[PDB]
Structure formats: C-alpha cells, structure tokens
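Notes to self, I-superfamily conotoxin r11a:
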Amino acid sequence: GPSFCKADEKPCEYHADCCNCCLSGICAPSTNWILPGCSTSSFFKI
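result:
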C-alpha cells in the first residue's frame, strides 16, 4: 500500500487530499516553518 494523495499547487475541499495540505487557495507540502494552517489531531485512539 504505497502513499496515495494529491500533489501541491492543486488545492482540495478538505485537507488530506494532498500528500501534505490543500487549502482553497492552493495545495502545499508539509515542509513549512512559520505558516500555520494544518492542525489535525485525534480526539481519541483508533
């Protein structure tokens, strides 16, 4: 099961479509520094 997902530049509706992040503006990689936007956390376990 290889990692499947969309690429940068092409944004998405939610945030996991891209291999990193995809806001309405555009899709972006996960290698960032002071740019906030993706804050996903599990409320519980599996």
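- The CA atoms of residues 13 and 40 lie 15 Å apart.
- The chain has one domain: 1-46.
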